[PDB]
Ligand binder design. Structure first.
Ligand SMILES: OC[C@H]1O[C@@](CO)(O[C@H]2O[C@H](CO)[C@@H](O)[C@H](O)[C@H]2O)[C@@H](O)[C@@H]1O
Length: 263
C-alpha cells in the first residue's frame, strides 16, 4: 500500500513529534507523491504566494498596476517589516511589495497586498478563480500565523497547494509575463536556505516560499528545475502539538531529501 517514500516520511514524522504533509508533482509524467496530502495545514507565510499571484492576475488587464506606488505610514507596520520600515512616510509599488513579501517575508508588505485585493476574501476569491477549491485566507498579518490545532482558518492541503503552485509557475493560471515574474521573485527568496533547498542538489534551480508560525509550524513550497529533466513542485507543511514548539526547518530538508531519491 504505502511506498518506501511514504514510509520514510512517516518515520521522519514520528521522530519529529509533529504532523507532516507533503505533496510532490513531477511534471515529466504528472505523477503525484503525497503524505497526508488531503489534510489541512496552517499556511502561514506560504499564503503570500497566492496574494502576490492575485495581484499579478489583476495586472494582466491593468498593465501599470505593478508600478502603482502605495503609501507606507508608521501605523501600517506589524510584527516583521524588514523592507517596509525603510519606506515609512514614503511608498512602495505593488511590485516592490510583492518582492518584499515573497523574498523577505515582510508582513506589512503582505497586508498591503491583501488590501489591494479587498481583504483576505479577495485572496480566496482569486484562488477559487484559478481552480483552487481548498485554499482559504481568513485573516491578515500577524494573526493568520496562529496555527491553532483544528482551526480551519488560513489553511490549505499539500495536494491543493502543489497543484496551484504548478499552475501558477509552470502552467497557465497566469499570463506568460506574469508567470515569469512570479518565478523570478520565488527564485530570489532569501529565507529558504535551511528548508527544501537544503535537501536538494545544489545544481538544481529552486524557487520557494517559506512559512513559520505558532505551534512550531514550519512550511516551504517550491518549484524546482532539476538538471536534465522536467521541473517539479514540492510542498512540505509541518506543525507540532504544543504552542511554543521550536521551528524545524531541518524536517523539511529531510522530507525533500527523501522525495528526491524516488525521482
Ligand atoms: O498595511 C495596512 C493595511 O493592511 C490591512 C489589512 O490588509 O490592515 C492591517 O494593518 C492595519 C494597520 O497596521 C491594522 O489596523 C489592521 O487590523 C490589519 O489587518 C488594511 O486594512 C490596511 O489598509
Amino acid at each position: 500500500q504505502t511506498s518506501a517514500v511514504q514510509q520514510k516520511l512517516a518515520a521522519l514524522e514520528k521522530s519529529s513529534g509533529g504532523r507532516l504533509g507533503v505533496a510532490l508533482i513531477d511534471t515529466a509524467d504528472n505523477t503525484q507523491v503525497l503524505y497526508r496530502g488531503d489534510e489541512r495545514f496552517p499556511m502561514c507565510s506560504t499564503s503570500k504566494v497566492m496574494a502576490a499571484a492575485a495581484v499579478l492576475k489583476q495586472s494582466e488587464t491593468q498593465k501599470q498596476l505593478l508600478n502603482q506606488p502605495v503609501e507606507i505610514k508608521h501605523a501600517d507596520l506589524v510584527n516583521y517589516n524588514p523592507i517596509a520600515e525603510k519606506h515609512v512616510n514614503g511608498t512602495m509599488t505593488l511590485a516592490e511589495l510583492s518582492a518584499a513579501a515573497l523574498q523577505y517575508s515582510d508582513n506589512t508588505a503582505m497586508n498591503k497586498l491583501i488590501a489591494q485585493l479587498g481583504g483576505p476574501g479577495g485572496v480566496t476569491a482569486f484562488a477559487r478563480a484559478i481552480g483552487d477549491e481548498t485554499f482559504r485566507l481568513d485573516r491578515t498579518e500577524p494573526t493568520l500565523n496562529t496555527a491553532i490545532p483544528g482551526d480551519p482558518r488560513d489553511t490549505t492541503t499539500p495536494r491543493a497547494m502543489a497543484q496551484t503552485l504548478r499552475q501558477l509557475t509552470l502552467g497557465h493560471a497566469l499570463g506568460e509575463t506574469q508567470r515569469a515574474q512570479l518565478v523570478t521573485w520565488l527564485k530570489g527568496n532569501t529565507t529558504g536556505a535551511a528548508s527544501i533547498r537544503a535537501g536538494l542538489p545544489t545544481s538544481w534551480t529552486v524557487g520557494d516560499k517559506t512559512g513559520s508560525g505558532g505551534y512550531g509550524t514550519t512550511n516551504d513550497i517550491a518549484v524546482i528545475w532539476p538538471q536534465g529533466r522536467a521541473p517539479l513542485v514540492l510542498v512540505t507543511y509541518f506543525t507540532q502539538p504544543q504552542q511554543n514548539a521550536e521551528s524545524r526547518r531541518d524536517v523539511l530538508a529531510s522530507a525533500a531529501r527523501i522525495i528526491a531519491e524516488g525521482l
